[PDB]
Amino acid sequence: NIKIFSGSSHQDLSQKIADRLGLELGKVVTKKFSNQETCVEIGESVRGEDVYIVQSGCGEINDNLMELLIMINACKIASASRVTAVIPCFPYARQDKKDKSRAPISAKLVANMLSVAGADHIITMDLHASQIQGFFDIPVDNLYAEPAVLKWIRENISEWRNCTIVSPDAGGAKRVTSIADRLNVDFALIHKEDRMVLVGDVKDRVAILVDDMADTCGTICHAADKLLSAGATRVYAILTHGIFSGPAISRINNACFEAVVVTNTIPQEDKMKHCSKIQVIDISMILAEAIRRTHNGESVSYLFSHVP
Amino acid sequence: NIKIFSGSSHQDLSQKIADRLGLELGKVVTKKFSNQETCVEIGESVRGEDVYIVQSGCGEINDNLMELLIMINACKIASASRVTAVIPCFPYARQDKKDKSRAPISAKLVANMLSVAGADHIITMDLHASQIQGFFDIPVDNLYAEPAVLKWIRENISEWRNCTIVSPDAGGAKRVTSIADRLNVDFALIHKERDRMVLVGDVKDRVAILVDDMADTCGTICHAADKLLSAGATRVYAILTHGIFSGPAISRINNACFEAVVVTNTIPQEDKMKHCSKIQVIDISMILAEAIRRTHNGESVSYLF
Amino acid sequence: NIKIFSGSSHQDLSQKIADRLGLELGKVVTKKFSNQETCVEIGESVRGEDVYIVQSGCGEINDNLMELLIMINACKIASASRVTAVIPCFPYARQDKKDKSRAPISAKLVANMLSVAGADHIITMDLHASQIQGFFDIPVDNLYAEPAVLKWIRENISEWRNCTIVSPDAGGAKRVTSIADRLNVDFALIHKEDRMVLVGDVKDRVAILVDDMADTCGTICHAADKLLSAGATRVYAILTHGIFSGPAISRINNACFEAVVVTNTIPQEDKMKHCSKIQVIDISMILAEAIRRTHNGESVSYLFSHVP
Amino acid sequence: NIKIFSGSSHQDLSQKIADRLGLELGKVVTKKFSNQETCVEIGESVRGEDVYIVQSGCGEINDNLMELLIMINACKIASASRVTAVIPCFPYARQDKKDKSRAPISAKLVANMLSVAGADHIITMDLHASQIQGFFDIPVDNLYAEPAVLKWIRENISEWRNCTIVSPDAGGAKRVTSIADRLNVDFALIHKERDRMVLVGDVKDRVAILVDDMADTCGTICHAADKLLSAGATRVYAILTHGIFSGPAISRINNACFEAVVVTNTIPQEDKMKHCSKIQVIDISMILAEAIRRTHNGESVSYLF
Amino acid sequence: NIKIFSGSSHQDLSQKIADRLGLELGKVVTKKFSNQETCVEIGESVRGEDVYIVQSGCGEINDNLMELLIMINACKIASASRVTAVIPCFPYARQDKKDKSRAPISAKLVANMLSVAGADHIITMDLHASQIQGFFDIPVDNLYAEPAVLKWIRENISEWRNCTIVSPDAGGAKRVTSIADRLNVDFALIHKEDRMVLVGDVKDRVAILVDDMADTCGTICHAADKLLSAGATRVYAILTHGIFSGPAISRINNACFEAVVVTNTIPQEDKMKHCSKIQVIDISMILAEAIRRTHNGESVSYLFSHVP
Amino acid sequence: NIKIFSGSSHQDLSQKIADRLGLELGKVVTKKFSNQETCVEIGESVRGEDVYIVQSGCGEINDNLMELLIMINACKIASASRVTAVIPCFPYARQDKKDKSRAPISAKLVANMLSVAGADHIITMDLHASQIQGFFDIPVDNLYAEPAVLKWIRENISEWRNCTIVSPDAGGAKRVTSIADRLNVDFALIHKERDRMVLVGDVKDRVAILVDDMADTCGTICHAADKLLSAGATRVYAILTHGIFSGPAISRINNACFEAVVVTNTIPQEDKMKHCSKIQVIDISMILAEAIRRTHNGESVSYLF
């Protein structure tokens, strides 16, 4: 009685997941107006069924978020037994603190919206800040791409046993030290003051910039120069979420990266056509597995240190 | 004590409102990220103030709604005393029932999002359906453009004394009969066979005034006009409180036989009017300004009805 | 594990439903005081069971509503797995807007009361206004009597292919056009200003007044005269909810109706004894079916265009 | 700023309260539909006001509760600043526990209905059980008639100095011992074998004063009186704060040997007193008026205890 | 899919329950800081499982309450299907009214805390005041020790058919009359004014002081003297909850009780070592049974008048 | 209108705050039952007042939290106008994420308990993580000790102009770089191999200032100091905003090479300082007093940041 639906026309990721579960994506009649006012219609009964809605990758974040909330609403009032929002890349995740300003904690607002819309459970990957799980009261499964990253590293970087994992900023210290300790290698950190300061040993070593996401890439691009100027043999950047908006693709093609690796939490096909340094790690099996485990009441923690 | 902020670049309506109240719009820094991720930042203290946020009138409904929600939230966690959302045109108002389908009741979702965002009060105009008020637990003041529309009809159509108020569809019956009744004239309604349109009511040799709460692509209201002409209507006018003139609208009305198309200021019309001469806008900023002033001073708002 | 209970002594409708489900109504010890203070006692365990409570027809709306809420409360604190309020005719449904006055939206208050009492699901028929579903957050199944009305029409009115469906008021335009389009006949509308205005073709045709409910019947009675004065061959009135209070039965016996048809969402037996123009459409099978579908997680939409 | 409205035709208590506060009762149109469907309509603006709704005292508990709820809701969506429900006699207060059965905790249901209706504060008198206060999350002020009862006992029973306060049943023990203690006298309690009544305590050759929070049919309090006589009670009085004298009550007390039956103004007694001479009512309107005035002015209400 | 966990190191009662259910207590990694800041870690998946958490007996009520809430929180966000708080002796139960003072109704606060923590159901024994069930909205099963007390009485007191059940205070009138009527014996009540007044017949009879709990025991000890001074042959005290704090054990050893009986809702082993008048009624089977019934959706009312 | 109450016997901080505001602490009777069952009783009326409850600083975190919750609840059901919890050190702040385990997010539990207890506003200092603010729906003002720490560094360390701010672990990076940046100096971070500690950053021949939001047993900060010395640090200082010096802390710092250990007044330090000479406390009562005064008067609190 499992039912999986896709956000928009970006069946992409959602279709891979459905395939891995031996299912077809459920039918959804969609109509979009001038004003981008989204009207959705669930094309099949979900009464008494375990529903999973996978968010699109359309690019327009507000349209995608509303579409998601609207679909959650529709399934809930259509008597679904349970509705789970599968959100690979959590919207407004970066806006999770006030940081000495009269700003909104939009990530909390989003969590509240998902809650009132009718979400009973959230499945996501690499929340920008683990504390975001505390923005909900409903259970959240925060999947890590770490296992998949450690594996990609050991298989694609010959010098991995002597590389350095580097955080592009101060906040990612924990993330990198965790990966460095697992691989038993060094770590380093970059801190932007407009000037970057690097601490840690990278000389004559392969440097691997690791972060949860990359958007305009101004930061990772500048970190790469800094790393090379410090004596790094070559530089890689591995982000789980590849937003790559604005001049990102332009900055990547010009940067000194050996390669830029990201998962497919966000559609990457079009970006790859204009950027060859980009390589993608498919995380559909991890999302597919978490969904199947959630449905069967089986252990999902198994995926935090294991590549299905 | 009172503070008024505006959403998006849209400030025409917002500025009109602040002026009428003798105030300047609150300062707010708005940076739109990559994927249009909305970033807002209240530029001044609202601690303990009676805050009013006037919704943007900038086409993209989802960006507008998110910015409004984010602004409400920022003010609330900034210890504002009270936050009122002033929403001339309630987003997703049309999606207010299932209509025999597994559809969302999006207008209730929106009501819930505004509530959890921290809105203490809502001020809107001509809700697509009065019942939408019940979608909230917080107070909602639903202002009407009817008085102004009535007044415009009497002062612009010489034959209004014996005109016919026509509803573009079955659902607008209550709206047109309310107006026809106030003016003491005939009403008629059109329905698309479920397609061919059918007309019930007397419009032969008399001015036909199409009335509807809103019109987007204007395909419905335009086709209704033809029917009205074929039915022997002298001239056909069209009055919409919310003019969401998108897509083919801008041209459809020109190519249409409308003697004129009247809409309110609830949504920015300057851009359109340029490419459309027969459009006339009724300014409702004064009505909204008065509602805010009364809401703040605890004065009666019903009088504006 | 389905359990069905009846509101009060009006086992009537609730017993037909239980019979159709092959069940007996659950035991309920009831005690009513002077002040009509209702004390209820569930006479059997409902722990872990799917409960359905059918509202009475006692006539005293406030007593019935409280009794319903009290029973919902009792089952919920008695650990029922789920409690569904089966409310054929929704209380205070007409009070669903302010309509330019400082009035209560009692229909919303009622929905909130049902929610805090512990209702997890609502099953009702022909809500006065579809928007009422939005007064709840829990799922609502709003059954239509339309299929049963269209069927009664085709079977009891010879001239149905040439009749006119008429709305007694402005608000019922949608309802009638929907029925007219399905039958492929005309529609007409009556609007009261103290004077009625009729628009639409009814001359030399059978006119069928269709509405969701009839109370004092002053309106439908006056609409019938109006229709005949306009050249209608004869007039019928089909309401799903037959309140028939005050001088209704007197006004019906004197009116020019060929017949007045209503469903049994409200007990009609006593009214029929004093009014022979009244005929009843039994909707117990529709309620019974919706309940069985809800329980089995099967499609209830099937009943929106199909007579079980 | 302060506004007082009354429920149902009952206005005796409501009018007494408004008078003591130097106010007139708010205007409210009340049309009772067919099946007694309650229709209410606030006749004036309450926007930003401190509204107090005094419950009806008109027998039908469910109609009364619905009218009270509907009134609270109307005021709340009318932007009232605050809504306090003044409920002398809390409906369904007796149904406040399961008592080893699959029964409703109706008093908690009622508390929840009042809350979701929008009540911000409750003012009541002698809750059947103090714990009922915990059924709300909003503030509840539970006034007591004890001081007034005490005062009436001392000024009406010459032998009060050595009288016995008796509880009609096991559950009223705490209530009677509290009074007996204040007056410095004996207490006794009666219990129906679960039936024959048993009496524990000394009442022989002394006035017996039956005390109970409420009495409906008076079958319990009347039988208790006989027992008290058989036990050698000089004379037997009966003091109830809530006199819901329904059914056989009106006559049972007459035919009873009560030297008198004292009740408060929490429920309309004029009608009954007519057919019953030995009934005496303690007016509590002043107590309620003072609670409202203090609630509004932020003054101490506990002093009234 | 039933999972039972214990509050703290006091596996005691919780282990007996688990044994009776044929289960082992679930694994829980616990770490306690200086400040008694409790950090818990569920050592096994509870995803999709029916969870029961039994509160400790550690003695420090606030530490136990927090630990309980924290464990409820952990299981809820760990996706448990349902979480039930099994609380033998409800915390702050006595603080359930204002009683003419500006005091907190802590029992209500506790119920709210248990609710927001994530409790879906409460199982407890002899709530100080039945009204406490109304402090929650989630279902509460309030088990009675009465059946076990009536049984202990008939089996350990030869003169039980001619004894007197006595309430140590005014509030316990109902409790005792209920037990007296079941046994068909007399009842009596004690009321403290600093002076106790007794009403009821105890002369030449065995007096049994019955109450829900005993703490410092100053009250029951003074009631015993009073009873003997009134002509009682001997005195027993049966409390369901034996807090026995402060000088309780000292006051019991000196008092004139034939014996003081309590259930094991609270660990009694250490207290027994210093007090031989104390005897314990094991109520683990009742808690075990209520849990098994709750899980299987079977009747728990069966335990209100029956000793499993 | 404003009332300030204190929790537990702790009143040092509370008294300092009331003094700065020209007020006396509200009266509250506190009886601790048997199993430490917390019993509180507001000794005066708070009806309609702006109540502020300053958390106890008495070691036992669970007793303190319960007393705070019980006090909030008592005031709320006593009709207080508004209840603000002033919590210098947010309990369970460290338990704010699952960290890849089936662990509680205790800090969110606490936030929820405070909310349901009736807290309308929270005032705290240096939340272990800014995100904790999002655990509430009610407003939270997170004050910072940074300005005061900065000021203390400049006025007590002669070599501060070229000192190195060091973080005891990976998680404190953002905190130290923020300070190092304000002072225009170097930062360094230490990490325990997951064990041996690693150090990244330049501390050779220069004063090392260990900065952390809090320190309990001081095992982490003490070991970090050794490392710093071995790395060639001139002298090593330690600055903690919350000094929960429990267990071995009191001695570990003495035996440590700290040139000094600076902590704020958020937790009682008098007792400890006695057995530790190198401890210096920065008083933050003025910062809290100002936050309360501004919160009450609707004045800007952000200025204190």
Curated annotation (Swiss-Prot), chains B, D, F:
GO terms for biological process: 5-phosphoribose 1-diphosphate biosynthetic process; hypoxanthine biosynthetic process; nervous system development; purine nucleobase metabolic process; purine nucleotide biosynthetic process; pyrimidine nucleotide biosynthetic process; ribonucleoside monophosphate biosynthetic process; urate biosynthetic process. ATP binds at R94, Q95, D96, K97, K98, D99, H128. Residues 204-219 are annotated as: Binding of phosphoribosylpyrophosphate. Pathway: Metabolic intermediate biosynthesis; 5-phospho-alpha-D-ribose 1-diphosphate biosynthesis; 5-phospho-alpha-D-ribose 1-diphosphate from D-ribose 5-phosphate (route I): step 1/1. Keywords: ATP-binding, Charcot-Marie-Tooth disease, Deafness, Disease variant, Gout, Intellectual disability, Kinase, Magnesium, Metal-binding, Neurodegeneration, Neuropathy, Non-syndromic deafness, Nucleotide biosynthesis, Nucleotide-binding, Retinitis pigmentosa, Transferase. InterPro entries: PRib_PP_synth_CS (IPR000842), Pribosyltran_N (IPR029099), PRibTrfase_dom (IPR000836), PRTase-like (IPR029057), Rib-P_diPkinase (IPR005946), Rib-P_diPkinase_bac (IPR037515). Homodimer. The active form is probably a hexamer composed of 3 homodimers. Catalyzes the synthesis of phosphoribosylpyrophosphate (PRPP) that is essential for nucleotide synthesis. This is Ribose-phosphate pyrophosphokinase 1.
